Design an enzyme around this catalytic site. Structure first.
Site, PDB file in Angstrom:
ATOM      1  N   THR A 199      -7.054   3.604  -1.750  1.00  0.00           N
ATOM      2  CA  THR A 199      -6.668   2.250  -1.427  1.00  0.00           C
ATOM      3  C   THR A 199      -7.710   1.211  -1.786  1.00  0.00           C
ATOM      4  N   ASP A 221     -21.870   6.247 -19.880  1.00  0.00           N
ATOM      5  CA  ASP A 221     -21.416   4.920 -19.442  1.00  0.00           C
ATOM      6  C   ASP A 221     -20.151   4.403 -20.173  1.00  0.00           C
ATOM      7  N   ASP A 279       0.849  -1.180   0.000  1.00  0.00           N
ATOM      8  CA  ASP A 279       0.000   0.000   0.000  1.00  0.00           C
ATOM      9  C   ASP A 279       0.888   1.235   0.000  1.00  0.00           C
ATOM     10  N   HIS A 293      -1.142   2.302  -5.309  1.00  0.00           N
ATOM     11  CA  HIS A 293      -1.062   3.754  -5.627  1.00  0.00           C
ATOM     12  C   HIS A 293       0.210   4.296  -5.042  1.00  0.00           C
ATOM     13  N   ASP A 297       2.470   2.936   3.009  1.00  0.00           N
ATOM     14  CA  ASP A 297       1.440   3.951   3.006  1.00  0.00           C
ATOM     15  C   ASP A 297       1.288   4.576   4.398  1.00  0.00           C
ATOM     16  N   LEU A 357     -19.847   3.873 -23.239  1.00  0.00           N
ATOM     17  CA  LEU A 357     -20.208   2.990 -24.321  1.00  0.00           C
ATOM     18  C   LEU A 357     -21.029   3.720 -25.379  1.00  0.00           C
ATOM     19  N   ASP A 390     -22.308   9.819 -26.123  1.00  0.00           N
ATOM     20  CA  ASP A 390     -22.401   9.117 -24.859  1.00  0.00           C
ATOM     21  C   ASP A 390     -23.260   9.944 -23.886  1.00  0.00           C
ATOM     22  N   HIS A 435       1.951   8.766   4.866  1.00  0.00           N
ATOM     23  CA  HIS A 435       1.011   9.791   5.285  1.00  0.00           C
ATOM     24  C   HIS A 435       1.638  10.718   6.332  1.00  0.00           C
TER      25      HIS A 435
HETATM   26  C1  LIG Z   1     -16.312  -2.496 -17.830  1.00  0.00           C
HETATM   27  O1  LIG Z   1     -16.655  -3.872 -17.731  1.00  0.00           O
HETATM   28  C2  LIG Z   1     -17.954  -4.133 -17.243  1.00  0.00           C
HETATM   29  C3  LIG Z   1     -18.175  -5.632 -16.993  1.00  0.00           C
HETATM   30  O2  LIG Z   1     -18.179  -6.330 -18.220  1.00  0.00           O
HETATM   31  C4  LIG Z   1     -19.022  -3.516 -18.149  1.00  0.00           C
HETATM   32  O3  LIG Z   1     -20.194  -3.456 -17.377  1.00  0.00           O
HETATM   33  C5  LIG Z   1     -21.278  -4.262 -17.852  1.00  0.00           C
HETATM   34  O4  LIG Z   1     -22.005  -3.564 -18.839  1.00  0.00           O
HETATM   35  C6  LIG Z   1     -23.201  -4.168 -19.334  1.00  0.00           C
HETATM   36  C7  LIG Z   1     -23.902  -3.152 -20.251  1.00  0.00           C
HETATM   37  O5  LIG Z   1     -24.110  -1.909 -19.581  1.00  0.00           O
HETATM   38  C8  LIG Z   1     -24.148  -4.619 -18.203  1.00  0.00           C
HETATM   39  O6  LIG Z   1     -25.163  -5.462 -18.714  1.00  0.00           O
HETATM   40  C9  LIG Z   1     -26.468  -5.198 -18.138  1.00  0.00           C
HETATM   41  O7  LIG Z   1     -26.686  -6.029 -17.004  1.00  0.00           O
HETATM   42  C10 LIG Z   1     -27.985  -6.087 -16.431  1.00  0.00           C
HETATM   43  C11 LIG Z   1     -27.976  -7.126 -15.311  1.00  0.00           C
HETATM   44  O8  LIG Z   1     -26.789  -6.939 -14.578  1.00  0.00           O
HETATM   45  C12 LIG Z   1     -26.793  -7.648 -13.320  1.00  0.00           C
HETATM   46  O9  LIG Z   1     -26.059  -8.865 -13.341  1.00  0.00           O
HETATM   47  C13 LIG Z   1     -24.669  -8.717 -13.623  1.00  0.00           C
HETATM   48  C14 LIG Z   1     -24.017 -10.090 -13.841  1.00  0.00           C
HETATM   49  O10 LIG Z   1     -23.992 -10.899 -12.681  1.00  0.00           O
HETATM   50  C15 LIG Z   1     -23.996  -7.838 -12.553  1.00  0.00           C
HETATM   51  O11 LIG Z   1     -22.665  -7.537 -12.894  1.00  0.00           O
HETATM   52  C16 LIG Z   1     -24.730  -6.507 -12.381  1.00  0.00           C
HETATM   53  O12 LIG Z   1     -24.144  -5.817 -11.287  1.00  0.00           O
HETATM   54  C17 LIG Z   1     -24.388  -4.388 -11.303  1.00  0.00           C
HETATM   55  O13 LIG Z   1     -25.395  -3.986 -10.383  1.00  0.00           O
HETATM   56  C18 LIG Z   1     -25.108  -4.273  -9.012  1.00  0.00           C
HETATM   57  C19 LIG Z   1     -26.264  -3.806  -8.132  1.00  0.00           C
HETATM   58  O14 LIG Z   1     -27.030  -2.839  -8.820  1.00  0.00           O
HETATM   59  C20 LIG Z   1     -23.779  -3.644  -8.553  1.00  0.00           C
HETATM   60  O15 LIG Z   1     -23.380  -4.138  -7.287  1.00  0.00           O
HETATM   61  C21 LIG Z   1     -22.641  -3.869  -9.561  1.00  0.00           C
HETATM   62  O16 LIG Z   1     -21.555  -3.022  -9.226  1.00  0.00           O
HETATM   63  C22 LIG Z   1     -23.101  -3.610 -11.003  1.00  0.00           C
HETATM   64  O17 LIG Z   1     -23.364  -2.224 -11.123  1.00  0.00           O
HETATM   65  C23 LIG Z   1     -22.763  -1.583 -12.270  1.00  0.00           C
HETATM   66  O18 LIG Z   1     -23.448  -1.876 -13.488  1.00  0.00           O
HETATM   67  C24 LIG Z   1     -24.768  -1.344 -13.622  1.00  0.00           C
HETATM   68  C25 LIG Z   1     -25.427  -1.859 -14.909  1.00  0.00           C
HETATM   69  O19 LIG Z   1     -25.706  -3.236 -14.756  1.00  0.00           O
HETATM   70  C26 LIG Z   1     -24.696   0.185 -13.537  1.00  0.00           C
HETATM   71  O20 LIG Z   1     -25.965   0.768 -13.721  1.00  0.00           O
HETATM   72  C27 LIG Z   1     -24.101   0.550 -12.171  1.00  0.00           C
HETATM   73  O21 LIG Z   1     -23.983   1.935 -11.994  1.00  0.00           O
HETATM   74  C28 LIG Z   1     -22.712  -0.070 -12.011  1.00  0.00           C
HETATM   75  O22 LIG Z   1     -21.839   0.579 -12.905  1.00  0.00           O
HETATM   76  C29 LIG Z   1     -26.242  -6.737 -12.216  1.00  0.00           C
HETATM   77  O23 LIG Z   1     -26.493  -7.335 -10.964  1.00  0.00           O
HETATM   78  C30 LIG Z   1     -29.035  -6.428 -17.490  1.00  0.00           C
HETATM   79  O24 LIG Z   1     -30.315  -6.449 -16.894  1.00  0.00           O
HETATM   80  C31 LIG Z   1     -28.968  -5.425 -18.650  1.00  0.00           C
HETATM   81  O25 LIG Z   1     -29.920  -5.766 -19.654  1.00  0.00           O
HETATM   82  C32 LIG Z   1     -30.727  -4.651 -20.149  1.00  0.00           C
HETATM   83  O26 LIG Z   1     -30.223  -4.035 -21.337  1.00  0.00           O
HETATM   84  C33 LIG Z   1     -30.142  -4.924 -22.457  1.00  0.00           C
HETATM   85  C34 LIG Z   1     -29.450  -4.275 -23.656  1.00  0.00           C
HETATM   86  O27 LIG Z   1     -28.977  -5.300 -24.504  1.00  0.00           O
HETATM   87  C35 LIG Z   1     -31.516  -5.499 -22.842  1.00  0.00           C
HETATM   88  O28 LIG Z   1     -31.369  -6.495 -23.838  1.00  0.00           O
HETATM   89  C36 LIG Z   1     -32.204  -6.103 -21.610  1.00  0.00           C
HETATM   90  O29 LIG Z   1     -33.528  -6.495 -21.920  1.00  0.00           O
HETATM   91  C37 LIG Z   1     -32.171  -5.139 -20.406  1.00  0.00           C
HETATM   92  O30 LIG Z   1     -33.082  -4.065 -20.605  1.00  0.00           O
HETATM   93  C38 LIG Z   1     -33.991  -3.966 -19.481  1.00  0.00           C
HETATM   94  O31 LIG Z   1     -33.569  -3.016 -18.509  1.00  0.00           O
HETATM   95  C39 LIG Z   1     -33.520  -1.672 -18.979  1.00  0.00           C
HETATM   96  C40 LIG Z   1     -32.842  -0.763 -17.953  1.00  0.00           C
HETATM   97  O32 LIG Z   1     -33.150  -1.199 -16.646  1.00  0.00           O
HETATM   98  C41 LIG Z   1     -34.937  -1.207 -19.327  1.00  0.00           C
HETATM   99  O33 LIG Z   1     -34.921   0.087 -19.897  1.00  0.00           O
HETATM  100  C42 LIG Z   1     -35.599  -2.174 -20.314  1.00  0.00           C
HETATM  101  O34 LIG Z   1     -36.960  -1.811 -20.426  1.00  0.00           O
HETATM  102  C43 LIG Z   1     -35.427  -3.659 -19.931  1.00  0.00           C
HETATM  103  O35 LIG Z   1     -36.323  -4.037 -18.904  1.00  0.00           O
HETATM  104  C44 LIG Z   1     -27.537  -5.400 -19.224  1.00  0.00           C
HETATM  105  O36 LIG Z   1     -27.257  -6.593 -19.935  1.00  0.00           O
HETATM  106  C45 LIG Z   1     -23.393  -5.350 -17.093  1.00  0.00           C
HETATM  107  O37 LIG Z   1     -24.264  -5.526 -16.007  1.00  0.00           O
HETATM  108  C46 LIG Z   1     -22.171  -4.559 -16.643  1.00  0.00           C
HETATM  109  N1  LIG Z   1     -21.427  -5.249 -15.594  1.00  0.00           N
HETATM  110  C47 LIG Z   1     -20.868  -4.613 -14.550  1.00  0.00           C
HETATM  111  C48 LIG Z   1     -20.120  -5.444 -13.541  1.00  0.00           C
HETATM  112  O38 LIG Z   1     -20.948  -3.392 -14.378  1.00  0.00           O
HETATM  113  C49 LIG Z   1     -18.655  -2.073 -18.498  1.00  0.00           C
HETATM  114  O39 LIG Z   1     -19.527  -1.636 -19.519  1.00  0.00           O
HETATM  115  C50 LIG Z   1     -17.192  -1.908 -18.910  1.00  0.00           C
HETATM  116  N2  LIG Z   1     -16.878  -0.506 -19.046  1.00  0.00           N
HETATM  117  C51 LIG Z   1     -16.449   0.017 -20.195  1.00  0.00           C
HETATM  118  C52 LIG Z   1     -16.161   1.508 -20.214  1.00  0.00           C
HETATM  119  O40 LIG Z   1     -16.280  -0.666 -21.214  1.00  0.00           O
HETATM  120 CA   LIG Z   2     -23.484   5.488 -23.722  1.00  0.00          CA
HETATM  121 ZN   LIG Z   3      -3.073   5.970   2.282  1.00  0.00          ZN
END
Ligand SMILES: *[C@@H]1O[C@H](CO)[C@@H](O[C@@H]2O[C@H](CO)[C@@H](O[C@@H]3O[C@H](CO[C@H]4O[C@H](CO)[C@@H](O)[C@H](O[C@H]5O[C@H](CO)[C@@H](O)[C@H](O)[C@@H]5O[C@H]5O[C@H](CO)[C@@H](O)[C@H](O)[C@@H]5O)[C@@H]4O)[C@@H](O)[C@H](O[C@H]4O[C@H](CO)[C@@H](O)[C@H](O)[C@@H]4O[C@H]4O[C@H](CO)[C@@H](O)[C@H](O)[C@@H]4O)[C@@H]3O)[C@H](O)[C@H]2NC(C)=O)[C@H](O)[C@H]1NC(C)=O
Ligand SMILES: [Ca+2]
Ligand SMILES: [Zn+2]
Ligand SMILES: Cn1c(CC(=O)N(Cc2ccccc2)c2ccccc2)n[nH]c1=O
Ligand SMILES: Cn1c(CC(=O)N(Cc2ccccc2)c2ccccc2)n[nH]c1=O
Ligand SMILES: [Cl-]
Ligand SMILES: [K+]
Ligand code: NA
EC number: 3.1.4.39
Length: 806
Positions: free
Chosen positions: A159, A687, A121, A309, A261, A689, A683, A265
Site C-alpha cells: 500500500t 542502479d 486500496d 494494488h 482492501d 543505469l 550494471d 484481507h
Molecule cells: C528514477 O528517477 C530518479 C529521479 O530522477 C533517478 O534518481 C536520480 O538519479 C541521479 C543519478 O543517480 C541522482 O543524482 C545524484 O544526486 C546527488 C544529490 O542528490 C540529493 O538531492 C536530490 C535532489 O533534491 C535528492 O533527490 C536526493 O535524494 C536521495 O537521497 C535522500 C537521502 O539520502 C533520499 O531520501 C532519497 O530517497 C534519494 O535517495 C535515492 O537516491 C540516492 C542517490 O542520490 C540513492 O543512493 C538512494 O539509495 C535512493 O535511491 C539527494 O538528497 C548528487 O550528489 C550526485 O552527484 C554525484 O555524482 C555526479 C555524477 O555526475 C558527480 O558529477 C557529482 O560530483 C557527485 O559525485 C560526488 O559523490 C560521489 C558519490 O557520493 C563521490 O564518489 C564523488 O567523489 C563526488 O563527491 C548525483 O547527481 C539523483 O539524486 C536521483 N534522484 C532520486 C530521487 O533518487 C533514478 O536514477 C531513476 N531510475 C531509473 C532506473 O532510471
Molecule cells: Ca549502474
Molecule cells: Zn492490504
C-alpha cells in the site's frame, strides 16, 4: 506536549498547518494528539446523517447537523450531496446520459479545471467487470471517460510503496518506501504501519504531487484522511473546499478509501462479503458526482479513479517456514509475508554468510513456493535493489503463498483469506485506472500502463512542471484530449566512425585461429557492397540507435547484421538483425567450431583476443549475431569476427544458445519475421543505469575485456502480423528481455534437464520494457520510424508479461 486548549471555531480542516503548542484543526491533528478540545464537536458533526429527506427541505439552518437542506446551503457550500435531487427535483449524476465534455465548463474565477484523485486500496482490476452490476457510478465513469483494462502497480505491491509512487512517479527504490515495514541501517530505525516513526520526513524521498503543486503556486487539499473520519465527511470537506473563494480554493484534491482492501484481507478478493464494500465505494463516488453537479462542477473537474494494488487468495495453511530449511534460523531476521527479506539478526557477528543462507534456500523442496535471490539478481523490471533499506537477500514468493520464519510467528505474533505484495506482473495484483473530465478523452479505451507514469499526467493536468521521475513523459499523451507536453527525441551525443579496411591480418596477434583459407568478380563486388551497408535497410529497420553519452564507437556493416562497436568496451553496444518467416536455421560446420577471425576494419588494440579466454578458466564466449542464422555459408564467416564476440559463462551459453538456435526462429515464425537488437549491459552498482568504464568490477582474466552483468534483446515485428517485419506500414509490436549473465543456473531448479524445459521460463521472468534497456545502455531506440513519437514512447514502456487474459 501541546497546549491543546484553543478553538477550531470557523477553522475546520484548515489548509495551512499552525505549529504546536498552538492547537490544530487540520486532518493530521488527530495523528499528533494536537487537535483543539472542540475539534470533534465542531469539525466532525454527525447529527441527522448524510442525506436530505423530504421534510428537511427549506428547513431552518441548524448548525449542529452534519449537512444541510436549508435554502442557503448551496451558497454556504455545505448541503447534503443529495439536496438538489430530493428538494429541487434534480436527477442523480449516474442517471443522466453521458455527454462529451469538449471544453471545461467551469464557474467564473476558476483558473483551471480542478483535479480530484479518488484512490481506492486493494481495488483489483477484475472488480471492474465482476462487480459492475453493483457499481453503476464507477461504471459510468469508466465507460464515458478514459479507462485502461488494468494498471500495473510497482513492486512490492504493498500500500505505502504504491500510494507514494502514485504521488511521485518514482520507483520505491528511489522514493525510499521499499515496503510496509522497513529497517534502515543508517538510522537503526524501523518503519511500520503502527507507530510514530513513519511520520518522520527522513523516510520520504522524492517530490510528491502536493509539494510540486505548492512550489509552483498551485494550492492543494490535504491528501491524508484520518482512519476514523467517515467517507461522507471526507467528500463534504472536499466539496466545501471547492466552494472557497478563488484566492483560497485548492486546485488539487485527494480522497482515499481503505476499502475494499480492508475486507479483502478478511474474506479474500471474491468473498461473498466483498459485494457490500464495492456497493459502498460506489455510493461514495455517487455522492462526489452529485455534489459536483450541485456546484455546477461536474463538467469542469477532472476525476481520476485509481487503485494502488489488487488482492490475492492467501491463507495460513499456505505458509512456507524458513525453519524447515535452515538450521541457524535464529541468526536471521525476516521481513515476512508475500515477500521475504532476510538480514543478520546481529552485525556484531562476522560468522554470518549470505551465500550459505542462499544455498540452503535454493531448490530444496520439489514444489517450493518461494525463490531466494541476491537483490542485484532480481529481474531488472522490478527495479528493486538500489536502496540501503532493501536487504541483500530477497525471497520472491509464489502467488497465493506466504513465507514466515518459524511456525510460532504464524500463531503467536486463521486470520486472513486475502493478501497482496507479490511480483507486480501477477494478474491478481493488477489494479484500476479511470480518467473522467474535460481534459481526458471521451469513451476511450487505452492499453494497460504502469502507475509510475501518472505523476507526469497529473502535473500536465495542473499545468505543473514535474520533478525528475521514472515516468516517460509523453508515453500517456494518448489519454488526453489536450496535451501540456510535446516530447522530443534526446540528441545524439556521440556520432559513429565508419571504418573501412585498414589492417592486414598479420598485424593481429590475438591467439585466434580460423579454418577460412578457401577462396570471381560477381561475388566480390557483392561482398564489398555488403560491407558498405547495402543490406542495411533490411537489418536496421528503425534507424541506428542513438548513443546518448560521450564515447568512441564504429558502425560495422555485414550481409546479415549491423553493429555499433565500442572501442572503449571492446564489444558491440548493439547488434541489429532481421530474421524473416522464411529464413533457415543451419548448424556451425565442424571445421569452423573454434573459428574467430580478426576484423580488418578495427585495430588490434581495440579488439578482444582469444588468449584471455583460454587463460580464463571460468569465462568462455558467445556471439551477438548467431552463426546459426547466417544466410549463406559465405556470410557465416562474418559471424565469427572478433568484433561479434562477447564474454559468456558456460552456464549462460546454455541459455544464450537456446535463444539464438531455437527461439529466434520460433518468434520469426509466429510473428511473421522479427528484427532483433541484442547487446551487453553493465550494471555493477545495480542502479538500473549504464555503468561508466571506471565502474566495471570484472574483466576476462588478464585483459581489458569487461564482463557484462546482463544481456538484452529487443524483438520487434509488425502489430498487423499479416505484414512481414521488414515491410510494416503501421504500429509495431515488441517484447524484450534483460537476462542476468550468471556463472551458474541456480535460479532455474530444472536446469539439469533439456533447455526446452526451462530456458523460456527464465526469459519470461526477465521480460523488460525497451525503456529499461535504454537506462541500462544509454542508447535510444526507434529513432527512424513512420510512427508518431508519443506512440513510440508508449511502445518503449510496453511490458510483455506472459500472464493469461485478466
Ligand atoms: C528514477 O528517477 C530518479 C529521479 O530522477 C533517478 O534518481 C536520480 O538519479 C541521479 C543519478 O543517480 C541522482 O543524482 C545524484 O544526486 C546527488 C544529490 O542528490 C540529493 O538531492 C536530490 C535532489 O533534491 C535528492 O533527490 C536526493 O535524494 C536521495 O537521497 C535522500 C537521502 O539520502 C533520499 O531520501 C532519497 O530517497 C534519494 O535517495 C535515492 O537516491 C540516492 C542517490 O542520490 C540513492 O543512493 C538512494 O539509495 C535512493 O535511491 C539527494 O538528497 C548528487 O550528489 C550526485 O552527484 C554525484 O555524482 C555526479 C555524477 O555526475 C558527480 O558529477 C557529482 O560530483 C557527485 O559525485 C560526488 O559523490 C560521489 C558519490 O557520493 C563521490 O564518489 C564523488 O567523489 C563526488 O563527491 C548525483 O547527481 C539523483 O539524486 C536521483 N534522484 C532520486 C530521487 O533518487 C533514478 O536514477 C531513476 N531510475 C531509473 C532506473 O532510471
Ligand atoms: Ca549502474
Ligand atoms: Zn492490504
Ligand atoms: C511524512 N511524509 C509523507 C507521508 C505523509 O505525508 N503522510 C501524511 C501524514 C503526515 C504527518 C503525520 C501523519 C501522516 C503519511 C504519513 C505516514 C503514513 C501515511 C501517510 N510524505 N512526505 C513526508 O514527509
Ligand atoms: C494512506 N491514507 C490516506 C491517503 C494519503 O495519505 N495519501 C498520501 C500518502 C503519502 C504517503 C504514503 C501514503 C499516502 C494519498 C492519497 C491519495 C493518493 C495517494 C496518496 N488517507 N488516509 C490514509 O490512511
Ligand atoms: Cl513489506
Ligand atoms: K575459458
Ligand atoms: Na539449477
Amino acid at each position: 506536549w501541546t497546549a491543546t486548549s484553543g478553538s477550531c471555531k470557523g477553522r475546520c480542516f484548515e489548509l495551512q498547518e499552525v505549529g504546536p503548542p498552538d492547537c490544530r484543526c487540520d486532518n493530521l491533528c488527530k495523528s499528533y494528539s494536537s487537535c483543539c478540545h472542540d475539534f470533534d464537536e465542531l469539525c466532525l458533526k454527525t447529527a441527522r446523517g448524510w442525506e436530505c429527506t423530504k421534510d428537511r427541505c427549506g428547513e431552518v439552518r441548524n448548525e449542529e447537523n452534519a449537512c444541510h437542506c436549508s435554502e442557503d446551503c448551496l451558497s454556504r457550500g455545505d448541503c447534503c450531496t443529495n439536496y438538489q435531487v430530493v428538494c429541487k427535483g434534480e436527477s442523480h449524476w449516474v442517471d443522466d446520459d453521458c455527454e462529451e465534455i469538449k471544453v471545461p465548463e467551469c464557474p467564473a474565477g476558476f483558473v483551471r479545471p480542478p483535479l480530484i484523485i479518488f484512490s481506492v486500496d486493494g481495488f483489483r482490476a477484475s472488480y471492474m467487470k465482476k462487480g459492475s452490476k453493483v457499481m453503476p457510478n464507477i461504471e459510468k465513469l469508466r465507460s464515458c471517460g478514459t479507462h485502461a483494462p488494468y494498471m500495473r502497480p510497482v513492486y512490492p505491491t504493498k500500500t505505502f510503496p504504491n500510494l507514494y509512487t502514485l504521488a511521485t512517479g518514482l520507483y520505491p527504490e528511489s522514493h525510499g518506501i521499499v515496503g510496509n515495514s522497513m529497517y534502515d541501517p543508517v538510522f537503526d530505525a524501523s518503519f511500520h504501519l503502527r507507530g510514530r516513526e513513519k511520520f518522520n520526513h527522513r523516510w520520504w524521498g522524492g517530490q510528491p504531487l502536493w509539494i510540486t503543486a505548492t512550489k509552483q503556486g498551485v494550492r492543494a487539499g490535504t491528501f491524508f484522511w484520518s482512519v476514523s473520519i467517515p467517507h461522507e465527511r471526507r467528500i463534504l470537506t472536499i466539496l466545501q473546499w471547492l466552494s472557497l473563494p478563488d484566492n483560497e480554493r485548492p486546485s488539487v484534491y485527494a480522497f482515499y478509501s481503505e476499502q475494499p482492501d480492508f475486507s479483502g484481507h478478511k474474506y479474500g478478493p471474491f468473498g461473498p462479503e466483498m459485494t457490500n464494500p464495492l456497493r459502498e465505494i460506489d455510493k461514495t463516488v455517487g455522492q462526489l458526482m452529485d455534489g459536483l453537479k450541485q456546484l455546477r462542477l461536474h463538467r469542469c473537474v477532472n476525476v481520476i479513479f485509481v487503485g494502488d494494488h489488487g488482492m490475492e487468495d492467501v491463507t495460513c495453511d499456505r505458509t512456507e517456514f524458513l525453519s524447515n530449511y535452515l538450521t541457524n534460523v535464529d541468526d536471521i531476521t525476516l521481513v515476512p509475508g508475500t515477500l521475504g527479506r532476510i538480514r543478520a539478526k546481529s552485525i556484531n557477528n562476522s560468522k554470518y554468510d549470505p551465500k550459505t543462507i542462499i544455498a540452503a534456500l535454493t531448490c530444496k523442496k520439489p514444489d517450493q513456493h518461494f525463490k531466494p535471490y541476491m537483490k542485484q539478481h532480481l529481474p531488472k523490471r522490478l527495479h528493486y535493489a538500489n536502496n540501503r533499506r532493501i536487504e541483500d537477500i530477497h525471497l520472491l514468493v509464489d502467488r497465493r503463498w506466504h513465507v514466515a520464519r518459524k511456525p510460532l510467528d504464524v500463531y503467536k505474533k486463521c486470520f486472513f483469506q486475502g493478501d497482496h505484495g507479490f511480483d507486480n506482473k501477477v494478474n491478481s495484483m493488477q489494479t484500476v485506472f479511470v480518467g473522467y473530465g474535460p481534459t481526458f478523452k471521451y469513451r476511450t479505451k487505452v492499453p494497460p500502463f504502469e502507475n509510475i507514469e501518472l505523476y507526469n499526467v497529473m502535473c500536465d493536468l495542473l499545468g505543473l512542471k514535474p520533478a525528475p521521475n521514472n515516468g516517460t513523459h509523453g508515453s500517456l499523451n494518448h489519454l488526453l484530449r489536450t496535451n501540456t507536453f510535446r516530447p522530443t527525441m534526446p540528441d545524439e551525443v556521440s556520432r559513429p566512425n565508419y571504418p573501412g579496411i585498414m589492417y592486414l591480418q598479420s598485424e593481429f596477434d590475438l591467439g585466434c585461429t580460423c579454418d577460412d583459407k578457401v577462396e570471381n568478380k560477381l561475388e566480390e563486388l557483392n561482398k564489398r557492397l555488403h560491407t558498405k551497408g547495402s543490406t542495411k535497410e533490411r537489418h536496421l529497420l528503425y534507424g541506428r540507435p542513438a548513443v546518448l553519452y560521450r564515447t568512441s564507437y564504429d558502425i560495422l556493416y555485414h550481409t546479415d547484421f549491423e553493429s555499433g562497436y565500442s572501442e572503449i568496451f571492446l564489444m558491440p553496444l548493439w547488434t541489429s538483425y532481421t530474421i524473416s518467416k522464411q529464413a533457415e536455421v543451419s548448424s556451425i560446420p565442424e571445421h569452423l567450431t573454434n573459428c574467430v577471425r580478426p576484423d580488418v576494419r578495427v585495430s588490434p588494440g581495440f579488439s578482444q583476443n582469444c588468449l584471455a579466454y583460454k587463460n580464463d578458466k571460468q569465462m568462455s564466449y558467445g556471439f551477438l549475431f548467431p552463426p546459426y542464422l547466417s544466410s549463406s555459408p559465405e556470410a557465416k564467416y562474418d559471424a565469427f569476427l572478433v568484433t561479434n564476440m562477447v564474454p559468456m559463462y558456460p552456464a549462460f551459453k546454455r541459455v544464450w544458445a537456446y535463444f539464438q538456435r531455437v527461439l529466434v526462429k520460433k518468434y520469426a515464425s509466429e510473428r511473421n519475421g522479427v528484427n532483433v537488437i541484442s547487446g551487453p549491459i553493465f550494471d555493477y552498482n545495480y542502479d538500473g543505469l549504464r555503468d561508466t568504464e571506471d565502474e566495471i568490477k570484472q574483466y576476462v582474466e588478464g585483459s581489458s575485456i569487461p564482463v557484462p552483468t546482463h544481456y538484452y534483446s529487443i524483438i520487434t515485428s509488425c502489430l498487423d502480423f499479416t505484414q512481414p517485419a521488414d515491410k510494416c506500414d503501421g504500429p509495431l509490436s515488441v517484447s524484450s528481455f534483460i537476462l542476468p549473465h550468471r556463472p551458474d543456473n541456480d535460479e532455474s531448479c530444472n536446469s539439469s534437464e533439456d533447455e526446452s524445459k526451462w530456458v523460456e521460463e527464465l526469459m519470461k521472468m526477465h521480460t523488460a520494457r525497451v525503456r529499461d534497456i535504454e537506462h541500462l545502455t544509454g542508447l535510444d531506440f526507434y529513432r527512424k520510424t513512420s510512427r508518431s513519437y508519443s506512440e513510440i514512447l508508449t511502445l518503449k514502456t510496453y511490458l510483455h508479461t506472459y500472464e493469461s487474459e485478466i
